[PDB]
Amino acid sequence: SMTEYKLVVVGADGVGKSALTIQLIQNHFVDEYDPTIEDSYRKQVVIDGETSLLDILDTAGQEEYSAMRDQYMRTGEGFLLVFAINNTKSFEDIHHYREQIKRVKDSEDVPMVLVGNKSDLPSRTVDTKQAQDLARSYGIPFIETSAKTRQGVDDAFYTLVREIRKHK
Amino acid sequence: VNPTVFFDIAVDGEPLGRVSFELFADKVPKTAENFRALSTGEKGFGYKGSCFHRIIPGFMCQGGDFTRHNGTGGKSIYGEKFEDENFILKHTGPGILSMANAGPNTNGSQFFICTAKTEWLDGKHVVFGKVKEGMNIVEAMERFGSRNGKTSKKITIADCGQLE
Ligand SMILES: CCn1c(-c2cc(N3CCN(C)CC3)cnc2[C@H](C)OC)c2c3cc(ccc31)-c1csc(n1)C[C@H](NC(=O)[C@H]1C[C@@H]1C)C(=O)N1CCC[C@H](N1)C(=O)OCC(C)(C)C2
Ligand SMILES: Nc1nc2c(ncn2[C@@H]2O[C@H](COP(=O)(O)OP(=O)(O)NP(=O)(O)O)[C@@H](O)[C@H]2O)c(=O)[nH]1
Ligand SMILES: [Mg+2]
């Protein structure tokens, strides 16, 4: 029976966590803003020839409830660290998310992928090199995405599965 | 003299009962007047026919998206959004009526009714009314909710208006 991977999508509010996940699951793009409480999804995929079951937790970006992330971080196996390439604050927020995951899991070695979303917009404030340099300093992959065009959507989730496989 | 408004609630179209609200026009007149006008429909749009899209037991019942009917919309009588009028009033317990928002100065038509004290919302959401009659209707709406707020039946404002 196929292996199950517990993926968790985290990042500041409005960066496109839900748009990315719904693109993966439903193959369409939500242009409206429906702020998340918490949602979970399942999808089977084939990655590197091996069929895998993705269990995706789409989390809230509200800073107000930062204290309540610990339980889903304990449970999750791999994390998409999502920022938006036109939102320098959400890029700055990445550090806090990663440090929080490391603390809660008490490990330097947690599967993660840095995701720079909204690559379709012209208003970029975070240079790709900055993001790439940050990913390299974390030792994790960096994927540029657009939930609107689907660019990189599969790649971001599949790369995270690959990171979990290497870890196990 | 603070105005009173009513919602007649239905569940998958069957009547549940009436909730009435006192609106604190004496403390938050602009916010109270928006909710009043939207409850009468007098601008040609308002809450009649719209749903409670988010119900989380232990916390609150949220509704008021009459423009998109998916929890993302709504609009005020002043424009799509209006500013936070004041935060004088606090989320003190069950029955508090308060504006939903997407950050500072983004009030539209969405609102929520507390079913418990939610003090961490103080200073962030404008409180502007309280359940007067029918808190048991709000309590009965809770079982149609869930942890993330998805509802298991369609909870609707079948009718609404101002009481004299
Ligand atoms: C951590 C998980 N979580 C939780 C949470 C918090 C706690 N505690 C916090 C307090 N301590 C002391 C005890 C523990 C426990 N259990 C959970 C839930 C049950 O765990 C699944 C909440 C929440 C809110 C948002 C996102 C995640 C969230 C959120 C996401 S957008 C938002 N808030 C504000 C929301 N804007 C909108 O809709 C905009 C789109 C329209 C125009 C809005 O104006 N209103 C009205 C006020 C209430 C709020 N919605 C709402 O729904 O609050 C849910 C609530 C359960 C009250 C809080
Ligand atoms: N142009 C463009 N817009 C995007 C993209 N991803 C998300 N958006 C838009 O950004 C807004 C917020 O998206 P959403 O997926 O809800 O973000 P979130 O990270 O899930 N927000 P929350 O933390 O509140 O749950 C929506 O208007 C959505 O259409 C993208 O790649 N390109
Ligand atoms: Mg979301």
Residue numbers in the entry:
A (entry chain A): 0 to 167
B (entry chain D): 2 to 165
Paper text:
Most oncogenic RAS mutations are gain-of-function missense alterations at hotspot codons 12, 13, or 61 that result in an impairment of GTP hydrolysis and/or acceleration of GDP-to-GTP nucleotide exchange by these small GTPases, such that the normally tightly regulated cellular equilibrium of a RAS protein shifts predominantly toward the active, GTP-bound (RAS(ON)) state. This shift drives increased oncogenic flux via activation of downstream effectors and signaling pathways linked to cell proliferation and survival. RMC-6236 is a RAS(ON) multi-selective noncovalent inhibitor of the active, GTP-bound state of both mutant and wild-type variants of canonical RAS isoforms with broad therapeutic potential for the aforementioned unmet medical need.
Here, we describe RMC-6236, a potent, oral RAS(ON) multi-selective tri-complex inhibitor designed to treat cancers driven by a variety of RAS mutations, and with the potential to overcome many of the frequent resistance mechanisms reported following inactive-state RAS-GDP inhibition. We then measured the biochemical potency of RMC-6236 for RAS-RAF complex disruption in vitro using recombinant RAS variants, the RAS-binding domain of BRAF (RAF-RBD), and CypA proteins. Formation of the tri-complex with either wild-type KRAS, NRAS, or HRAS proteins potently disrupted RAF-RBD binding in a concentration-dependent manner, with EC50 values of 85, 66, and 82 nmol/L, respectively.
